[PDB]
Design an enzyme around this catalytic site. Structure first.
Site, PDB file in Angstrom:
ATOM      1  N   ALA C   8     -47.501 -11.986 -40.435  1.00  0.00           N
ATOM      2  CA  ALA C   8     -46.389 -11.830 -41.328  1.00  0.00           C
ATOM      3  C   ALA C   8     -46.551 -12.831 -42.493  1.00  0.00           C
ATOM      4  CB  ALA C   8     -45.092 -12.117 -40.579  1.00  0.00           C
ATOM      5  N   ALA C   9     -47.789 -13.147 -42.878  1.00  0.00           N
ATOM      6  CA  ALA C   9     -48.030 -14.168 -43.941  1.00  0.00           C
ATOM      7  C   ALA C   9     -48.613 -13.639 -45.269  1.00  0.00           C
ATOM      8  CB  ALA C   9     -48.965 -15.282 -43.403  1.00  0.00           C
ATOM      9  N   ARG C  14     -46.179  -5.602 -53.242  1.00  0.00           N
ATOM     10  CA  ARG C  14     -45.758  -4.228 -53.470  1.00  0.00           C
ATOM     11  C   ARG C  14     -44.269  -3.914 -53.227  1.00  0.00           C
ATOM     12  NH1 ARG C  14     -50.656  -1.493 -50.317  1.00  0.00           N
ATOM     13  NH2 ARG C  14     -50.460  -3.543 -49.242  1.00  0.00           N
ATOM     14  N   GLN C  78     -50.463 -19.871 -42.285  1.00  0.00           N
ATOM     15  CA  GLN C  78     -51.629 -19.482 -43.029  1.00  0.00           C
ATOM     16  C   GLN C  78     -51.322 -19.900 -44.446  1.00  0.00           C
ATOM     17  OE1 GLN C  78     -52.188 -15.355 -43.983  1.00  0.00           O
ATOM     18  NE2 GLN C  78     -54.459 -15.505 -44.136  1.00  0.00           N
ATOM     19  N   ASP C 109     -45.046  -5.542 -40.637  1.00  0.00           N
ATOM     20  CA  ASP C 109     -44.476  -4.437 -41.394  1.00  0.00           C
ATOM     21  C   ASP C 109     -44.624  -3.047 -40.715  1.00  0.00           C
ATOM     22  OD1 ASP C 109     -47.148  -3.948 -41.799  1.00  0.00           O
ATOM     23  OD2 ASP C 109     -47.108  -4.109 -44.014  1.00  0.00           O
ATOM     24  N   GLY C 146     -56.098   2.210 -43.750  1.00  0.00           N
ATOM     25  CA  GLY C 146     -57.522   2.152 -43.407  1.00  0.00           C
ATOM     26  C   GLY C 146     -57.862   3.470 -42.703  1.00  0.00           C
ATOM     27  N   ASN C 234     -45.358  -0.878 -46.822  1.00  0.00           N
ATOM     28  CA  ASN C 234     -45.840  -1.779 -47.895  1.00  0.00           C
ATOM     29  C   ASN C 234     -44.989  -1.772 -49.139  1.00  0.00           C
ATOM     30  OD1 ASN C 234     -48.009  -2.630 -46.394  1.00  0.00           O
ATOM     31  ND2 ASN C 234     -49.427  -1.044 -47.205  1.00  0.00           N
ATOM     32  N   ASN C 383       8.139  -0.370 -38.960  1.00  0.00           N
ATOM     33  CA  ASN C 383       7.728   0.539 -40.040  1.00  0.00           C
ATOM     34  C   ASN C 383       7.807  -0.252 -41.340  1.00  0.00           C
ATOM     35  OD1 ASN C 383       7.226   3.714 -40.555  1.00  0.00           O
ATOM     36  ND2 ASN C 383       8.287   2.772 -42.303  1.00  0.00           N
ATOM     37  N   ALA C 429      15.425  -0.854 -50.078  1.00  0.00           N
ATOM     38  CA  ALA C 429      14.357  -0.602 -51.066  1.00  0.00           C
ATOM     39  C   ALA C 429      14.481  -1.624 -52.214  1.00  0.00           C
ATOM     40  CB  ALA C 429      14.428   0.828 -51.578  1.00  0.00           C
TER      41      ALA C 429
HETATM   42  C1  LIG Z   1     -57.445  -5.022 -44.096  1.00  0.00           C
HETATM   43  C2  LIG Z   1     -56.331  -4.523 -43.156  1.00  0.00           C
HETATM   44  O1  LIG Z   1     -55.929  -5.200 -42.218  1.00  0.00           O
HETATM   45  N1  LIG Z   1     -55.847  -3.291 -43.427  1.00  0.00           N
HETATM   46  C3  LIG Z   1     -54.811  -2.628 -42.609  1.00  0.00           C
HETATM   47  C4  LIG Z   1     -53.347  -3.035 -43.048  1.00  0.00           C
HETATM   48  O2  LIG Z   1     -53.236  -2.554 -44.403  1.00  0.00           O
HETATM   49  P1  LIG Z   1     -52.117  -3.068 -45.395  1.00  0.00           P
HETATM   50  O3  LIG Z   1     -52.584  -2.874 -46.783  1.00  0.00           O
HETATM   51  O4  LIG Z   1     -50.775  -2.444 -45.052  1.00  0.00           O
HETATM   52  O5  LIG Z   1     -52.041  -4.650 -45.076  1.00  0.00           O
HETATM   53  P2  LIG Z   1     -50.851  -5.711 -45.364  1.00  0.00           P
HETATM   54  O6  LIG Z   1     -51.178  -6.293 -46.694  1.00  0.00           O
HETATM   55  O7  LIG Z   1     -49.545  -4.995 -45.270  1.00  0.00           O
HETATM   56  O8  LIG Z   1     -51.172  -6.757 -44.206  1.00  0.00           O
HETATM   57  C5  LIG Z   1     -50.872  -6.423 -42.852  1.00  0.00           C
HETATM   58  C6  LIG Z   1     -50.007  -7.554 -42.304  1.00  0.00           C
HETATM   59  O9  LIG Z   1     -50.774  -8.781 -42.331  1.00  0.00           O
HETATM   60  C7  LIG Z   1     -50.013  -9.794 -42.955  1.00  0.00           C
HETATM   61  N2  LIG Z   1     -50.961 -10.558 -43.776  1.00  0.00           N
HETATM   62  C8  LIG Z   1     -51.712  -9.922 -44.738  1.00  0.00           C
HETATM   63  C9  LIG Z   1     -52.637 -10.704 -45.502  1.00  0.00           C
HETATM   64  C10 LIG Z   1     -52.765 -12.086 -45.184  1.00  0.00           C
HETATM   65  O10 LIG Z   1     -53.582 -12.833 -45.794  1.00  0.00           O
HETATM   66  N3  LIG Z   1     -52.002 -12.666 -44.238  1.00  0.00           N
HETATM   67  C11 LIG Z   1     -51.156 -11.932 -43.478  1.00  0.00           C
HETATM   68  O11 LIG Z   1     -50.501 -12.489 -42.551  1.00  0.00           O
HETATM   69  C12 LIG Z   1     -48.965  -9.016 -43.855  1.00  0.00           C
HETATM   70  O12 LIG Z   1     -47.862  -9.915 -43.883  1.00  0.00           O
HETATM   71  C13 LIG Z   1     -48.690  -7.749 -43.076  1.00  0.00           C
HETATM   72  O13 LIG Z   1     -47.639  -7.894 -42.091  1.00  0.00           O
HETATM   73  O14 LIG Z   1     -52.388  -2.293 -42.292  1.00  0.00           O
HETATM   74  C14 LIG Z   1     -52.517  -0.855 -42.326  1.00  0.00           C
HETATM   75  C15 LIG Z   1     -51.511  -0.262 -41.302  1.00  0.00           C
HETATM   76  O15 LIG Z   1     -50.155  -0.587 -41.734  1.00  0.00           O
HETATM   77  C16 LIG Z   1     -53.916  -0.392 -41.866  1.00  0.00           C
HETATM   78  O16 LIG Z   1     -54.082   1.034 -42.025  1.00  0.00           O
HETATM   79  C17 LIG Z   1     -55.002  -1.101 -42.708  1.00  0.00           C
HETATM   80  O17 LIG Z   1     -56.331  -0.747 -42.178  1.00  0.00           O
HETATM   81 CO   LIG Z   2     -48.924  -3.186 -44.541  1.00  0.00          CO
HETATM   82 MG   LIG Z   3     -52.389  -6.801 -50.667  1.00  0.00          MG
END
Ligand SMILES: CC(=O)N[C@H]1[C@@H](OP(=O)(O)OP(=O)(O)OC[C@H]2O[C@@H](n3ccc(=O)[nH]c3=O)[C@H](O)[C@@H]2O)O[C@H](CO)[C@@H](O)[C@@H]1O
Ligand SMILES: [Co+2]
Ligand SMILES: [Mg+2]
Ligand SMILES: CC(=O)N[C@H]1[C@@H](OP(=O)(O)OP(=O)(O)OC[C@H]2O[C@@H](n3ccc(=O)[nH]c3=O)[C@H](O)[C@@H]2O)O[C@H](CO)[C@@H](O)[C@@H]1O
Ligand SMILES: CC(=O)N[C@H]1[C@@H](OP(=O)(O)OP(=O)(O)OC[C@H]2O[C@@H](n3ccc(=O)[nH]c3=O)[C@H](O)[C@@H]2O)O[C@H](CO)[C@@H](O)[C@@H]1O
Ligand SMILES: [Co+2]
Ligand SMILES: [Co+2]
Ligand SMILES: [Co+2]
Ligand SMILES: [Mg+2]
Ligand SMILES: [Mg+2]
Ligand SMILES: [Mg+2]
Lengths: 475, 475, 475
Positions: C8-9, C14, C78, C109, C146, C234, C383, C429
């Protein structure tokens, strides 16, 4: 010659309701009423409704519908819900022993079934000289329906129920509508052979298909492409799905007839509602019961009307209203509540934060703001001032009040019923009217204004108001 | 060099409307305005709108749009609706005899057509050196569209209309958009050969495809995958379908730009509306005309705003409002009506069952309950007590009222215009204000309370209230 | 033995929001809360949430959720968002060097991910002795996911990101859920080999699939047919799409349990809401936070309730309400505003254009019209007359007011707090109550009505009211 049986004696347990399943509604009618309206239009010689536990709660509704539709409708009782095949047996018992017409069977929970579909069924059954003709359709999601089993040359062999079907038969998307036509001797013969050794331990009407095929009797399936017309309702999810479909069809009929419906998805229209040409309906609106809207009106957004008549060119916006009439060119809303017996004349206005109950309001009269009008008759071209109350109720009792035409009443007037206000009279702002007011009199009761200078400096010392009167004093 | 013709001279009978078809709206603009905006952006040398019966009702709207879009738009008249091919003939008549640019034709009832789609069409037409390039798409439901007929090597041969097509041609799902580019000499030549021996007895533009193919002229079809951009509107069902699609696209654009829209399906946003980052829009909301909402606002549920400006951080909940402004951080609703000319300052509040019309309300001032404010100016940090009325209207006339800053007016005060209330003044509850109130004065008019002991025992003997005062007397 | 890491980092750019992505809500909970609830039910030995910039704004919410769910939840930081593979590295750092359990990874997410799906994943991973098991699904629109790459015998070879995929790989509809189970030694080994030479210049967790396949390690894909359970969010378009899906599932669960929901599409129900059998919910309704509705109620249309308890058989129609209770059989609406601390007793009524705040209202008491009740306690079977105000606030201060049982107060009464009205008392009234009223007393203050004869003829000469009093005079 045809007898139609409607099976409405199952428990309806999947509805999870203390209201009998066939009494649940969509678009202003119960499922049973929809089904009996459709059948009545087909006009069979005999119409028999099979009822179960309860029956006391449903049979009266059946008799009311028989009167409304101008025909007799027999009730046959099924004491225990032993299954659809047993319910048909119970239904046949309302026929003479010697009955020779075709027998049509449908369920009380297929509420979009229409006269045309039934007529096509009977016509097909007669044409192919079938022992049994079964209506079928094909669905993306066939869960809970009987699956149609065909041989390699596409002959119908059997109907298998959801509970009895194999994982692989469950993949079959052609389903039984549960609407059939039968040769009566063949039906009686097949029903006497049903047994209840299946997953539900019930006597399934559906087994008659395989039984008749056994006897080398002609079994015909007639595919209904418009699947909604034979969709069934076993639970509240299916009920709301079918209500949404029916509603899209009702709305569409209005649009093709000349009504702008901005958002069909959020505009609910009951089947008996009529709407005039070039009316516009805004989102979030329900038009319910026998509401009638004229031409060139504007209705909504966020309006709910039940049994309300609205004339031509009227505006009825953000209004919640029932059993009321709104005249041509009148303006109602936004945020207006009409309780039963409200009659607003042509070019009348009832504005924001106004509630009317059991009151007549004459042509061109305006009640524009923050007022309650209860049990009162008001004449033509009058104006009721903002924030007023027609006080009907003295703590124990309620009485009438009459207001004439061309009257102008002042804001914050309370009319303690019963009182009569004559034509062209006025009241001051802040009046409590407890006695009659002659025509052209001005009625008043508020005391005179007195200003107390520097009160704020004395009684709110150092408050922002005190500093402000100080600051205005200097500059 | 290109001339664009828009065909807008058909009768529009399937709309079942007394409003000319091309004037019906979606997302805050007529179909004709959408089409002329799209074309204007493409910036052709010539832009000609073909109009019919009426034309008197549409041509003025065309001239207003020409001024708005900063370009000339010619009107060509088609006296009788002899068909689309005849309408193009009439349109060409607004061109010089010797015109040599390409001719682009589109209908007035394809309102999602965009500049990019038109530019791609012209680019494709020029590239393949086509005599005619026709835009096509593929649809699940192609009812009512001209069907594209191709040879075995996929060459476009002809367009067949719904009314003229065989049951088997009707199954064709590739359809004519009715958007074309032509070589002008080839167009003029084909139009002179149209005859009207078809199911509609009309001169169909669509026949030009087969006529040009006859002459061995190059005929190119360009497939538009995003079918909505070329969907047509012949009736109100199609109009609402396309309005719903356009609205999903508008909402989506806001979401991708930073606006939370909880329920896109019930959130209607007109094309000119702007909305700031991190605003949240709750269900049942319409934002219409030139409404502008700032950042971090909360709007809805059940809010309708037309031409309302709302600053940043404001809350506008269950509000019905038009031609008004709401300042930064202000709070409006639930159940609040804003009529035109309302201006609420920053951190102002207009609460439940409040209506304002043509009034300015200064920074930090609160009108929290059950009140009407009409034709009045109120200063800063003032508080208007519940259930009050700014009485503008004396039965025949309407006047102004000014209330200063840091004023605290008592509940149930009526302000009989015109009056001035000075800064920091107070009014008692139940006051009728008919005269000016100096700064820091307390204005009053209500008489003193008198208690009548044992009135209930005497006048409501044996009522539940009498028994209760008796019971409270004992214990 | 299993450790679950939630990533979640990421920046969440977007979303175009100043609120951290994982804090955006659907159905009454943030994405992060949904994900941690699902994981908590699975009950892994270790639960680690990777947080980034901010973390100060999210880690407290994590600790509150740990307390609520009764378990520890570790935060790993992170520092910079170098990519999902780097975020997993950071998460592993909260584990002992010698950790031997499986490692499950999911994103913050994917908010519909459920305990069962996670348990199936772990069960499959253990069964096939996989180094990596990845959850996949198949989608009509795979944009942004992906893509799963398989060999000719359907072996999973690699995951390619939307940004890195060729036009032809982009056509692949099988997608990565981003939910994985790993052998820990194999995970650590693969992560040490990631490089960031790709379209995003990031260290992609997804590359571990190809890296492990390189080593001839077992890579297993487990297909989740119910795609919503692994849909990702996203941007705000995806968030509202998934909120709409979750809401249909919540509504459906209520319908199957016995609740009629007329229009699921316009009925929003938060996850913690409970609703009794045979309640009917009308369109345009949101039930939010910990609202609890009893059996046989009617709620809506156009009702929004947050944390409101409603007993059995109550009607709550067109009501906007929060942190309030509504007793059995009580009737609220239409157009009623309940602010926090409102408690209405059984068989109570709060009618149109009524607002209550911080007031208790006893059994059977009715406040039917146009009134504000603030900071007041009212007894049973009383009332309150229309258009009344409980005046809590004297310009600077706010106080209490007590009204007894069986009281009948007259319309347009202002109760200037603090005052006590005894049992069975009445007010006239138009009364301003500033002092206590004994039980069974009648309190009054309005002056007497005076009629001024012929005022209209004198002061509005030749007006329609003057002509009307003239006309009534003659006939
Ligand atoms: C490279 C990768 O993993 N791609 C996957 C990611 O894409 P997607 O483009 O959705 O990846 P996000 O950027 O949403 O990252 C996934 C999660 O990792 C966390 N986050 C991201 C980057 C970072 O440096 N640190 C970190 O903690 C984000 O907060 C998020 O909760 O999820 C999709 C499913 O929803 C998959 O189909 C993709 O294959
Ligand atoms: Co995502
Ligand atoms: Mg990104
Ligand atoms: C065994 C059988 O017939 N199955 C059919 C029935 O399934 P389904 O499971 O829907 O059957 P229901 O339980 O709804 O029964 C059908 C109708 O018969 C009535 N009833 C039922 C049991 C009883 O003992 N007495 C009685 O009168 C019910 O009130 C209902 O109106 O309808 C579906 C179409 O909607 C078909 O696809 C199924 O093949
Ligand atoms: C014969 C023809 O062209 N058919 C096409 C037309 O069908 P469609 O049946 O929709 O044709 P319309 O009747 O809507 O006519 C198209 C346009 O031409 C205008 N108009 C029409 C008749 C006339 O005499 N004068 C005139 O100006 C109308 O105002 C409208 O803007 O559009 C569809 C796409 O939406 C195409 O799939 C059809 O192949
Ligand atoms: Co059924
Ligand atoms: Co058309
Ligand atoms: Co008063
Ligand atoms: Mg059953
Ligand atoms: Mg036509
Ligand atoms: Mg008053």
């Amino acid at each position: 010659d045809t007898a139609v049986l409607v099976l409405a004696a199952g428990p309806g347990t999947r509805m999870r309701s203390d209201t009998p399943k066939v009494l649940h509604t969509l678009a202003g009618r119960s499922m049973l009423s929809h089904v009996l309206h459709a059948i009545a239009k087909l006009a069979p010689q005999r119409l028999i409704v099979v009822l179960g536990h309860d029956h006391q709660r449903i049979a009266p509704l059946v008799g009311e519908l028989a009167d409304t539709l101008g025909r007799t409708i027999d009730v046959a009782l099924q004491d225990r819900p032993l299954g659809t095949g047993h319910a048909v047996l119970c239904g046949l018992s309302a026929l003479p022993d010697d009955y020779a017409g075709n027998v049509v069977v449908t369920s009380g929970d297929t509420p979009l079934l229409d006269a045309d579909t039934l007529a096509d069924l009977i016509a097909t059954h007669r044409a192919v000289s079938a022992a049994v003709t079964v209506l079928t359709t094909t669905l993306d999601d066939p869960f809970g329906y009987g699956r149609i089993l065909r041989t390699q040359d596409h002959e119908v062999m059997a109907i298998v129920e959801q509970t009895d079907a194999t994982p692989s038969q469950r993949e079959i998307r052609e389903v039984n509508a549960g609407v059939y036509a039968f040769d009566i001797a063949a039906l009686r013969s097949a029903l006497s052979r049903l047994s209840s050794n299946n997953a539900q331990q019930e006597l399934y009407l559906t087994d008659v298909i395989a039984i008749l095929r056994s006897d080398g009797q002609t079994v015909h399936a007639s595919h209904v492409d418009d699947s909604a017309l034979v969709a069934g309702v076993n639970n509240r999810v299916q009920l709301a799905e079918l209500a949404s479909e029916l509603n899209r069809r009702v709305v569409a009929a209005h649009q093709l007839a000349g009504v702008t419906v901005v958002d069909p998805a959020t505009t609910w229209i009951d089947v008996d509602v009529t709407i005039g040409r070039d009316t516009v309906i805004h989102p979030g609106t329900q038009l319910l019961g026998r509401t009638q809207i004229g031409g060139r009106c504007v209705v909504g957004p966020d309006t709910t009307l039940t049994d309300v008549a609205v004339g031509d060119g009227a505006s009825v916006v953000r209004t919640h209203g029932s059993s009321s009439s709104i005249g041509d060119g009148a303006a109602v809303g936004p945020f207006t509540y009409l309780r039963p017996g409200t009659a607003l004349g042509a070019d009348g206005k009832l504005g924001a934060f106004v509630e009317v109950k059991n009151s007549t309001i004459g042509t061109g009269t305006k009640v524009p703001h923050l007022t309650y009008v209860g049990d009162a008759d008001i004449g033509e071209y009058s104006n009721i001032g903002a924030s007023s109350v027609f006080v009907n109720y003295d703590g124990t009792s309620k009485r009438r009040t009459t207001v004439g035409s061309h009257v102008r009443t002042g804001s914050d007037t309370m009319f303690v019923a019963p009182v009569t206000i004559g034509d062209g009279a006025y009241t001051g702002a802040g009046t409590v009217v407890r006695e009659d007011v002659p025509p052209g009199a001005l009625a008043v009761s508020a005391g005179p204004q007195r200003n107390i200078e520097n009160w704020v400096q004395r009684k709110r010392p150092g408050s922002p108001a005190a500093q402000a009167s100080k600051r205005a004093s200097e500059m």
